[PDB]
Structure formats: C-alpha cells, structure tokens
Amino acid sequence: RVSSGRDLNCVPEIADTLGAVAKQGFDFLCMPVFHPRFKREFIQEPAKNRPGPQTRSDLLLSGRDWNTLIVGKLSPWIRPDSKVEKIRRNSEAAMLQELNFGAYLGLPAFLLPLNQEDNTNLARVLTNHIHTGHHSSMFWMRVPLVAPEDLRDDIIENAPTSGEEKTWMWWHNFRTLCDYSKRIAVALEIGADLPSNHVIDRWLGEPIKAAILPTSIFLTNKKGFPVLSKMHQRLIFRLLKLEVQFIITGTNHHSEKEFCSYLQYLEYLSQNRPPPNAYELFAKGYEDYLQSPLQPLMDNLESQTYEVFEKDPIKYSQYQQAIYKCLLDRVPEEEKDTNVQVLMVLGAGRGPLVNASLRAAKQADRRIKLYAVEKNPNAVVTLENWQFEEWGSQVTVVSSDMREWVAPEKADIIVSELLGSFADNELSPECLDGAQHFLKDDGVSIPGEYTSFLAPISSSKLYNEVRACREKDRDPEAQFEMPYVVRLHNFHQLSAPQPCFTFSHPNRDPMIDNNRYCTLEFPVEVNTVLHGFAGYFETVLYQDITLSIRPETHSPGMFSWFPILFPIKQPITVREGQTICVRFWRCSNSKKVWYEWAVTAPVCSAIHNPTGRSYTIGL
Amino acid sequence: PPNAPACMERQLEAARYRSDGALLLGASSLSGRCWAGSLWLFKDPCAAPNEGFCSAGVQTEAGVADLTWVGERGILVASDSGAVELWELDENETLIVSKFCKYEHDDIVSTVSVLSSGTQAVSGSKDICIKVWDLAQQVVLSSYRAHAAQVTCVAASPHKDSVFLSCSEDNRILLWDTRCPKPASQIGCSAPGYLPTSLAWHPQQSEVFVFGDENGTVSLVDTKSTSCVLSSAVHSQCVTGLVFSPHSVPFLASLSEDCSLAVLDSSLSELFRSQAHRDFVRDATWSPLNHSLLTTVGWDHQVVHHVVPT
Ligand SMILES: Cc1cc2cc(C(=O)N(Cc3ccc(C(F)(F)F)cn3)CC(C)C)ccc2nc1N
Ligand SMILES: CSC[C@H]1O[C@@H](n2cnc3c(N)ncnc32)[C@H](O)[C@@H]1O
C-alpha cells in the first residue's frame, strides 16, 4: 500500500475539492491556506487596512480533517529573501501570518519552497516560528532534484545552456541554519530530466518525507495509461524502500484516461517491487531505531532477550556445522566409540548451543561430554530444567563465571557466542582468555577468530536521533560518545568497510594484550557530510564455517545481529577525492573496557569517549 | 439580467474597453468560502460595477487572473485552474457562452495576450511555461520553457504576428520571435536590476517598449538598443501594469500596488496622479470614444473614471 497526496494551487471550495480528491484515491491534499494571488500589505496604507476576511473560515472542515487531510502551502508571492526591503518586510509578516494560521488549523505539514540558493532570511523566520511555543507539526521543504535554471530549454540565443549538485546545497545550508530541526523535512521534487546518480544517492541520506511527481514526467504507453521511464522506475523503487509519501502535482495531461490512473501506476510498481528480503521483513519496525548495546557480562539478560537470540536457525546451524566438522577432525573413524570429547559451552544462555552441540554429535556419530557454563542464575534455572528433563547426565550445568570456574577436567572444544555487533564489544576476548586455562594444549575454540569492520556513513537522520538522546544529569554531548546497536536504513555508506580489530582464540601469546590501536583511511569519491561510522563484524567458527553481518559477506538469512554505530559530535564535510582518516582505540583497565575514536582527515574531530567518561563496558 | 451573477466578487482584476465603448470586466474572489471569478459586459461604463445594470454576465469555474478581448465578442481568460478559457458573446450580446476550456498549464495562468494575427495568443503562467495558442483549433501550438521562474507578463507585438515580449521573476526580459530556431532572446539592461513586473509595447514604434519593476521604476527601452533609453521612479511599490493612450503621441498610464495611478509623457515625466483607489490598482483602460478618459479598476471594488488633462 502507498500513501499519496494531491498537490493543487487552485481550490474554489474546500468541500467539493477534498471530495473529488478523495474519490480519486488520494490520502491528503496540498493546498494554499490563503489565496495564492491574494497579496497582502502590512505597513503602507491604504492597502494595509484591507477589509474583509483574509481567507476562509476554519469551520469548513472538521478538526479531524485539518489534522490529517490538509497540507499547507506557502503563498508563492512570499519572498523573504527578496532584494527590495519592502518586499522582505511584507514577506516576513505574510509568512508568519500563514505559518501561524497553519498551526491554528493544526495542520500536520506545511510546504515551503527552496527554489533558489539564498534562503537565509526564510530560515530565520521559520526558526522563529519553530521556537514559538511547543508544537510537532512538520515543515516540508520543496526543493527540486535539478534546479529550474539547469532544467530550462536552450531557447535563448544570447544565453546558451559540483554545479549539478546545487539543489542539495540549498537544503543542506538551510537545515544547518535551522540547526537540524526535527520538524523540517524534504519534499523532494522530481523533474523530467533526472540528474546524476551521485546527486540521487546523496538525497537518499536526507529526511525525504515526501516525493513530488509532476504529471509532465509521465510517459504514455500504447494504451495511453501514464507510465515512467526505466530510470524513473528505478528511482521510485528506491524511494519505496524509504517509505515516503508521493505527491502528484500538475493538471491532467492524459485527459483520455481518468486522473486516478497516475495513482494506480504507483500502486502497480509498489506491488511489483523485489520480494522483501527476509532480513527486511523480520527486522521491520527497527529501521534506524537506536538501542543501547547489550552487555551480557555486566548485566543478566532477560528471558525475551534470549528469545530473540534463538529465533535465528541459520546462526546455530552454522555453529552445529562448525562443531560437526571439528568432531570429525579430532576423533577418527576407528576411535568413534572409544574417544569421548569434552565440549564446554562457555556462556550457554538458555542452551541453544548445547542443543546444537548435541545435534552436531549425532550428525558426526561421535561421543561428547558437555559442560554448560553460564553466569546468569536466572538462565541457569532454564539450563537445569533442560538438563533434568531432556539432556540427562550428559550435560553438566555449571552456574559460575568461566574466568573463575575451576573445571574438573580440560576441554577438547570450547564453544561461545559472546560476540556483539562489533565482535569484541561484549568482552569475548577477556572471557575466553580467563577460560583459556582449562582448555587442552590442542584445544579448539569455536569461534577461533573474529574481526570488526568499520565504514564511514552519512545520515542526517541518525545524527538527528543521537542528538535527541540528550538526558538530564549527565554530559550534554555524552550521547555522541557511545555506540548504538541499530538496523541502519536511512543512511549512506561513504566507503567500503575495512577491518578494525581482530582476536584469535586460544591466544598463544605469552604477553596477552587486548588493547588495540587501529588507523583507517577511507577514500570518499563523493561530496557528503560524515555523521558516524558503521560497525560490522566477521567471525570464523571453524575452517570454512563463518558468520558475518558485514554487508558484502553477510551470512544469508541471519538476522541475529544489527550493525553498531559510532557517532561523532560535529558532522564533518567531505569532498570528492578526499580521504576520511579515522583512528580507533580499545582501552581497558582492571574494571572497565571502552572504545575511543577520532577523525583526523580531512579535518580533526575531538577524541570521543576519553577514559570511558561517557561509555564503558563492564568486566 | 439572465444567467447573470447576483453579485460580483470584490477584487476587480481587469478592465478592457471595446472599440464601440463597452467595458469588459473581470473580477475574482480572493477571500471567503468560495474562490472563483466572473466575466461582465458593461455597454454603459458609468454604471459599473453595479451588477443590476450590466449588459451581460457569467461566473467562471475559478478566478480571473487576466483577460483580453478576442476581436469584438471573444473574451480570452487566464484562470487559476491552469486553463486558458475563451468566452464568446452571443449575437444578442446578452449572454456569455464558454467556447473552450483547455487545461494545459500546471499552475496559475498569470498572463495572456492575443497576437496581432487575431487567431493566436500567448499565455504565461506560474508553471514556468509560455504557450502559443491557436484559438481556432483550440490547441497549444508550442510550449516554451525558457524562463527559470514564474512567468510574470507576456505582451504581443502590435503588428508582428510572431513577436511578443515576456518577463519572469528570474530577472529576464525575453524578446520572442517564433520565426527563429531559438525564438527567445534575452534583452534589457545587461546589469541585473530588480525583477520585471509589467510590459507594454509602444503603439506606434514597433521597436520601443516600456517595463516596470518591483521597485516602482518605469523604464523606456528600445529593442534595437541593448541599454536603457530612459527610466523614472514613478511608484513606491511594485508596478502592476502599463497602458498607452490611443493618442497619436501617446501617454503612458502606470498603476502599482501603492494604490496610485500615474500618467507620464514620452519623457516619463508625471502629468497626472490619482489616489482614487484605496487598494491595489489592477488594470487601466483608455476610452476609444473620449481619449481623455481613463477607466481603472481595483481590489477595492471601485471603477473610477479619470479625466486626463491632455
Ligand atoms: C548472541 C548475541 C546476539 C546479539 C544480538 C544483538 C542485536 O542485534 N540486538 C538487536 C536486535 C536484533 C534482532 C532483532 C530482530 F527483531 F530482528 F529479531 C531485533 N533487535 C539485540 C537483541 C537481540 C536483544 C546484539 C548483541 C548480541 N550479542 C550476542 N552475544
Ligand atoms: C548467549 S549470550 C552470552 C551469554 O554468556 C554468558 N556469559 C557472558 N560472560 C560470561 C562469563 N564470563 N562466564 C560465564 N558466562 C558468561 C552471559 O550470561 C550470556 O547468557
């Protein structure tokens, strides 16, 4: 299903227009609150004292209709950035008059045009209206994909036809003056002559709430029904992934067919999109939703937290397959009945790896002895109920910390799922290092290696959400110095993911040191604004068996982990050809472990989270 | 009168005199429950805008932004609905019947002008498009997108069937000639001034025209030249229209949003001024019967008959 609206600049009577628009299938209506040609004077008499009402009464619709069906439109004669002072003073008062009347009707959105480069005074008036009272209405900025001058036909003979990205700089410089207001979104206007994919890819990271589609860009098939080019369809398809509201403007040029045929073609493409990836279908409702990263070592996870871990069959089948191949390599065929392996699930949780180790033992036709070490006593109750009713004396539930547990015997294999979005962000190195002593000298660790990957991203939405995570009684910028687990959606990857930290288990190093310093340089072949760094990870369970949330090597179907996000305090502008240089540290003391990061090129940022002042991981 | 609106909307938008003396009126409602327009014929000009004393009348679907005569009985209308409407008077000249209503512009049709050939007319609109119409076949012959802003005003050449001026908020004044492969040619002051607002060819010299800007300055420009011949600061606000008197040596009637009317000579020197209006002055027309009368309408619902000292 598609949410759509009808843009109109002429409404004789609201009752009849809203009904005809509703009959054609539109959900809302874009219309001017004052008459477009009703220019008003606020200073100079006698035009100042114009009698009569300035517009029509609010009683023409219900409050429920205004709140959900009518989208306001600024009058086209209002030019706050004019060069004549008299035109500015009236445009200021007229914009405030229409914006206040828009909030008077409780309109959910308001349309304002970004049809030129300098909208500074326009930004100030809107900012003053935003900082007047507390409201939540949206302001849709009308900005075209390609500028009107860059879309004119070469009909003039004495004036023939980064410069092709000029409309984005209109928006970027506007929202920056308004300090990234949450009430200001983009109403992206599409032209017949689409621009470069660079400009298109750049708008994708912006809060595009509406997509305006004129009727002049629609093609005509043999039957006469309005369609689109193979480029416009590729644009509409990627707009549907952002789940935007499409707006139809302009009169009916396919007058042979009904005007609602434009709308039926959009629902046609929407139901013809590629089948939703099971990752998209499952993680629906978590797009760009920031979550605090889990700390299963410092905290005890709730039951429904473990329940989301176990809803992924692909994740544990890979674990079963890794243990299955490791069993066949350690015990030969002639020793399949005399050699019993000592498996130790370090961090058994509610026993999904214990069940997987049992299925890997039956599949390999080998004998095993299981120790289920879990520190969470609330989860040990589940393990011991499992151990008594089903597993039997084969599994030995150990309610202790693996770093402290004195094992009665050494282990042939140790299996752990102590990995987060950034691989080692749950202190899996420190846990397996403490548990490393009761592993045999030829013992195998599953996983035996994991690696975290970083990618610079651009998302003015995600930056605006982190910016909204400010809390009382703490550092006002502390929200920018902590990572968030989040399914990244409305963002733009600025460079290919590069590896960051890497750990190997068992750690044969005599001087074990899990502190890391990694410097990464990212070629950025586009102009953009850096907002944060995405964090993925790859891990090697055993030999070819691997897991990964890294996009290019993502394990198909595995939806257990979301990517992690390291933000930066101030967004950094990056030009084409420049290289983003970020540096990450993994610091630790006896009690806490934390990450510190800083950008050093093109410009330098501040060192984020020093001494773990804003974010620490508990040992 | 029959098929006649009981009352006409307050904002009088246009006033055009016919050759015989009848006054064509165009009003539109810019406030209130209903936003529409109407068309009126006043064979008696001194009875306007009283609706009970009108010769003919009809109300349109939307508002009347600009109108012009098409001969002696046709009325071309630029509607807010994005349509260029043509209305014709019946043989009785008591009813106004719609000829065609073609929705070809995607926004408000802001200006319209009939070419000298009588069978064609150009229309400018806020959709950034100028269209050359064929009044006979009721079809758009050409659609030009040469401007980058909303087209402010288009004006046809007096005796050239293919020449017409245009200006938009992109600070461009385009001289058109559909006989050329690239018909538009940007003219005016090479240095970008304030935005043009109104255009008016000279009724005698086929190369001379005047234009007023948003700052209140009326300029005298020759097309063969490429720089201002003469200019004068006439109004304190945006100049809405410019109309020339039907004299041999013609006067220039300027009207603006400062609720004032001015009549200048060939040197743009003021010879007459009238603050008779209390709101915006929208149109001005000279009487073909008495060349010293000047009928002006405005948004204050006044139809003032100005005696011009000539
Ligand atoms: C074993 C393990 C798993 C981890 C998972 C995650 C992780 O991504 N979320 C966010 C999330 C993931 C999936 C879904 C949905 F809806 F798709 F199922 C929703 N929300 C935490 C959540 C599972 C409680 C973070 C750290 C983890 N650490 C671990 N050791
Ligand atoms: C299945 S998610 C990680 C599990 O491992 C457990 N765990 C984490 N760290 C340790 C540790 N040092 N010793 C024992 N269990 C642990 C946690 O309690 C959680 O149930």
Author numbering:
A (entry chain A): 13 to 173, 180 to 637
B (entry chain B): 20 to 329
Q: Which sentences did the original study use to describe this structure?
A:
To elucidate the binding mode of AM-9934 to PRMT5, we solved the crystallographic structure of this ligand in complex with MEP50:PRMT5 in the presence of MTA. In the resulting molecular structure, protein domains are organized as previously observed with the PRMT5-TIM barrel domain in contact with MEP50 on one side and the PRMT5-catalytic domain on the other side. The 2-aminoquinoline moiety mimics the arginine of the substrate with similar interactions, a salt bridge with Glu444 and a hydrogen bond with Glu435 (6). Moreover, another H-bond is present between the carbonyl of the ligand and the amide of Phe580. The quinoline rings are also in van der Waals contact with residues Glu435, Trp579, and Phe327, and with MTA. Residues Tyr304 and Phe580 form a π:π stack with the pyridine ring of the ligand. The molecular structure of the complex allows us to rationalize the preference of AM-9934 for MTA-bound PRMT5.
Using shRNA-based screening platforms, several groups recently defined the Protein Arginine Methyltransferase-5, methylosome protein 50 (PRMT5:MEP50) arginine methyltransferase complex as a selective vulnerability in MTAP-deleted cells.
